[PDB]
Each structure stands twice: as C-alpha cells, then as structure tokens.
Amino acid sequence: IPVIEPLFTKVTEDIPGAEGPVFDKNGDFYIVAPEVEVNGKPAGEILRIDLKTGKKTVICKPEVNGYGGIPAGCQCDRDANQLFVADMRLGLLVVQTDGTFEEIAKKDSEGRRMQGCNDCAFDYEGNLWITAPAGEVAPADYTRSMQEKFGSIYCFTTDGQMIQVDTAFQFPNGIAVRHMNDGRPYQLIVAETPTKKLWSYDIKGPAKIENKKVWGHIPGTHEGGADGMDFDEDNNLLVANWGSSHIEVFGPDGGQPKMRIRCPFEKPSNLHFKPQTKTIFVTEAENNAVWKFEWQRNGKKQYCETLKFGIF
Ligand SMILES: [Ca+2]
Ligand SMILES: [Ca+2]
Numbered sequence: 385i386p387v388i389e390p391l392f393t394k395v396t397e398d399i400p401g402a403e404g405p406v407f408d409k410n411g412d413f414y415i416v417a418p419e420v421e422v423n424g425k426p427a428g429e430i431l432r433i434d435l436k437t438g439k440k441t442v443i444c445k446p447e448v449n450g451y452g453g454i455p456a457g458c459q460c461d462r463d464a465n466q467l468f469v470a471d472m473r474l475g476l477l478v479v480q481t482d483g484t485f486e487e488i489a490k491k492d493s494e495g496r497r498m499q500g501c502n503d504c505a506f507d508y509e510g511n512l513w514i515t516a517p518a519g520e521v522a523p524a525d526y527t528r529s530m531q532e533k534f535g536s537i538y539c540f541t542t543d544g545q546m547i548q549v550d551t552a553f554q555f556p557n558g559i560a561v562r563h564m565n566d567g568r569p570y571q572l573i574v575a576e577t578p579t580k581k582l583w584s585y586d587i588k589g590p591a592k593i594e595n596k597k598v599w600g601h602i603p604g605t606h607e608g609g610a611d612g613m614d615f616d617e618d619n620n621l622l623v624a625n626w627g628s629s630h631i632e633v634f635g636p637d638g639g640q641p642k643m644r645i646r647c648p649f650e651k652p653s654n655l656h657f658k659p660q661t662k663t664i665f666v667t668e669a670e671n672n673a674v675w676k677f678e679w680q681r682n683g684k685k686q687y688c689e690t691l692k693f694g695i696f
Contacts, residue, residue: 385603385640385641385642385643385644386642386643386644387630387643387644387645387646388643388644388645388646389645389646390645390677390678390679391677391678392647392648392666392675392676392677393675393676393677394438394673394674394675395433395435395438395665395673395674395675395676396415396433396438396439396440396673396674397438397671397672397673397674398672398673399415399417399431399440399667399672399673399674400417400418400419400420400421400672401416401417401418401419401420401428401456401653401669401672402415402416402417402653402667402668402669402672402673402674403415403416403417403418403455403456403457403612403653403654403667404416404455404456404457404458404469404470404503404612404654404667405458405654405655405656405665405666405667405674406458406459406460406467406656407460407656407658407659407686407688408460408465408467408481408688409460409462409465409688410465411658411659412432412481413432413433413435413658413665414430414431414432414433414443414458414467415430415431415433415667415674416428416429416430416431416455416456416457416458416469417429417430417431417455418454418455418456418472419454419672420445421452422452425452426451426452426453426454426473426526427445427447427452427453428445428446428452428453428454428455428456428471428473429442429444429445429455430442430443430444430445430446430455430458430467430469430479430483431443433674443479443481443482443483444479444483444484444485446469446471446474446477446479446485446487448474448487448522449522449523451473451474451522451523452473453471453472453473453474453477454471454472454473454474454500454518455469455470455471455472455474455477456469456470456471456472456501456502456503457469457470457501457502457503457504457515457612457654458470458504459504459505459506459512459686459687459688460686460687460688461478461506461687461688462506462510462687462688462690462692463510463692465481466478466479466480466481467479467480468504468506468512468540469485470501470502470503470504470514470515470516471500471501472500472501472502472517472518472526472528473500473518473521473522473526474487474500474521474522475487475488475489475490475498475499475500475501475516475521476488476489476498476501476504476512476514476538476540476546488540488546489540489546490521491546492538492546492547492548493545493546493547493548494548496548497520497521497524498516498520498521498546499516499518499519499520499521499535499536499538500516500517500518500519500520500521500526500528501514501515501516501517501518501538502515502516502517502518502556502557503515503557503558503559503612503654504559505559505560505561505572506561506686506687506688507561507563507569507587507687508561508563508567508568508569508687508690509542509569509590510542510687511539511540511541511542511569511590511591512539512540512541513537513538513539513549513559513561513572514537514538514539514540514559515535515537515553515556515557515558515559515574515575516535516536516537516538516556517529517530517535517553517555517556517557517577518535519534528555529553529554529555529556530554530555530577530578531554532554533552533553533554534551534552535551535552535553535554535555535556535576536548536550536551536552536553536556537549537550537551537553537556537559537574537593539590539591539593541590541591542590545591547591549591549592549593550585550593550596553574553576553583554576554577554578554579555576555577555578556574556575556576556577557575557576557577557609557610557611557612558574558575558610558611558612558613558623558624558654559572559573559574559575559613560572560573560613560614560615560621561573561587562615562619562636563684567690569587570586570587571584571585571586571587572584572585572587572593573599573600573613573621575602575609575610575611575612575613575623576609576610577608577609577610577611577626578607578608578609579609580601580602580603580604580605580609580610581598581599581600581601581602581610582598582599582600582601582602582610582613582621582623582634582638583596583597583598583599584596584597584599584600584638585597599638599639600621600623600634600638600639600640600641601639601640602623602625602628602632603625603628603630603632603640603641603644604625604627604628606627606628607627608625608626608627608628608651609625609626609627610623610624610625610626610632611623611624611625611626611652611653611654612624612653612654612655612667613655614655614656614657614664614683614684615683615684616657616679616680616681616682616683616684617681617682617683617684617685618636618681619636619684620633620634620635620636620642621633621634621638622634622645622655622664622679624652624653624654624655624666625652626651626652626653626669627650627651628650629646629647629649629650629652630644630645630646630647630652631644631645631647631652631655631666632644632645633645645677647666647668647675648675649668649670649671649673649675650670651668651669651670652666652667652668653667653668653669654666654667655667656683657679657682657683657684658676658683659683659685659686659689660682661682661683662678662679662680662681662682662683663676663677663678663679664676664677664678664679664683
C-alpha cells in the first residue's frame with residue numbers, strides 16, 4: 385500500500401490521553417485529556433488550546449456527584465456554539481465555552497442505564513451517532529469492552545431521545561457518517577478497535593440503521609487498531625490506527641486502505657480537520673501530544689460548518 389510521510393508540526397504537549405480534537409464555530413480548538421487523575425481516580429479535562437502559542441487552558445473538569453469524568457471524544461453543535469462530549473464515565477455531556485456543562489442521560493430511551501461513551505459523529509440532519517465501549521456510567525464500577533463484547537452504539541436524536549441502536553461490540557471507538565452529495569446521511573462507519581475491523585450500516589433515517597457489514601480491514605496485529613476517524617471532502621476515510629504508527633486512508637468503497645500516512649509516533653488516537661483547510665490535527669498517546677500535518681485536500685465539512693437557514 386502506498387505510504388506518505390508528510391511533515392508533522394508540533395501543536396501542544398503533556399495532555400494525558402490526548403483525544404477528541406475539535407474546532408468550534410469560531411475556529412477555536414479544543415482537546416480532551418481523559419487520563420488526568422487525582423488520587424488515582426478519574427479527573428479528566430476539556431481544554432482550549434491557543435494555536436499560536438500552544439498554551440493550554442482547562443475549561444471544564446467534569447464531575448457528577450463526585451464521580452470525575454473521562455472525556456474522550458467531541459463534536460461541535462451547529463445551532464449553538466457548544467460541544468457534545470462522549471465521556472467514558474459520564475455518558476454524553478454538553479459543554480459550553482464558559483466551561484459549564486450538563487450530563488445528558490443516566491438512562492436511554494428504553495430505561496436501560498446509559499453506558500460510558502468514547503466518540504461521536506453528527507450527521508447533517510443533526511442526529512448524533514455515539515460509540516459506547518464502557519459499561520454503565522457512574523456511579524457504576526468502571527468497565528470497558530476490550531475483552532468482552534458489551535460495547536453499544538447510540539443515536540441521540542433531534543427530538544432528544546437517546547436510542548440504543550446496536551450492541552455487542554468489542555470496544556466500538558471512532559465513528560463517522562457518510563453523506564450523499566445532496567447532504568442526505570446514508571452510511572454509518574464504526575471502528576471496533578481490537579478486532580481490526582471497521583463496520584458499516586445503511587442509515588435509513590434518524591436512529592434507524594440496517595445492513596451491518598464488515599466494511600474495512602485495519603492493518604497489523606499490534607495491540608490497538610482503529611481509534612478516531614474523519615472523512616475528507618472526497619469521502620476518503622482517514623482512521624488513526626493506534627499502535628501501528630500510521631493513519632490509514634480508505635477510499636469510498638472501503639476494504640483495504642488505499643494509502644497510509646506514517647506518523648512520527650506509534651499511537652495516533654484521533655484526528656480533526658481545521659475548517660476551510662487541508663490541515664489535520666492529530667492527537668497521540670505515545671507522547672500525550674497534538675500535532676498537525678497537511679493532507680491532499682480539505683476535510684468533509686462537519687455539521688457545525690453547515691447552515692440551518694441556507695438556500696443551497
Ligand atoms: Ca477514541
Ligand atoms: Ca475528528
């Protein structure tokens with residue numbers, strides 16, 4: 385498979401478990417630090433990074449009834465400038481730029497206890513597709529589906545329902561939505577880390593997925609596998625392959641990667657494009673750091689880059 389080795393430029397450093405890179409509607413940049421702990425207990429953080437200096441500010445260190453969060457993945461909303469944050473202990477959070485937050489769900493739409501979440505992806509209709517590789521949220525004892533198949537997938541809909549849409553994954557992790565050229569959502573892609581698979585579904589409607597398929601094969605037999613992912617503007621899927629030293633690039637039809645991107649580190653964890661550019665910000669777990677490099681084309685626009693009251 386062809387490999388490229390673009391220059392990686394350092395962005396910031398010393399962020400335990402550096403994850404969930406995201407841009408807001410004003411172009412500010414945020415990362416999560418899921419692995420910060422206090423006295424050995426979770427005390428994860430959500431940070432704003434000043435891109436010009438690399439300096440970090442902790443805007444939110446979420447805790448609910450004394451249980452600290454493990455914030456792990458982010459999306460920006462469209463109608464309000466607020467972050468949706470998948471948290472391995474707290475489920476789904478909505479975080480304001482002032483650092484305040486709310487916990488969205490202790491239970492799902494069927495009354496089952498919510499599971500801790502890892503990453504999420506908004507479709508253009510505003511529905512939020514979420515991976516949940518942890519067991520039940522706090523106050524339940526922390527568990528995660530690295531060995532056993534209890535990871536789930538949710539869709540948090542525009543009408544505020546937290547709907548479990550699949551179960552029995554071994555650590556569902558990154559997630560992405562493919563859209564038709566006209567904007568209609570039509571495929572959901574889910575990483576299952578240790579099995580070295582990417583799974584697809586047909587999106588038939590809000591919270592309606594069917595036709596589950598093994599869509600993509602992640603190289604290697606290292607511990608790790610597919611972590612975070614995003615589409616470029618041509619619908620190529622870029623996937624951090626934690627433990628492989630590469631980001632994989634899948635074409636529109638999946639299968640094997642058509643290209644790999646070598647990183648100067650072993651454990652890329654997640655990635656995000658800067659709007660209106662070819663620049664991909666990459667988090668990684670070897671150095672607990674953030675980098676950037678130039679891809680071949682711009683990113684696929686995120687939901688927060690679309691317009692509610694647009695004409696075209
Ligand atoms: Ca992840
Ligand atoms: Ca991303």
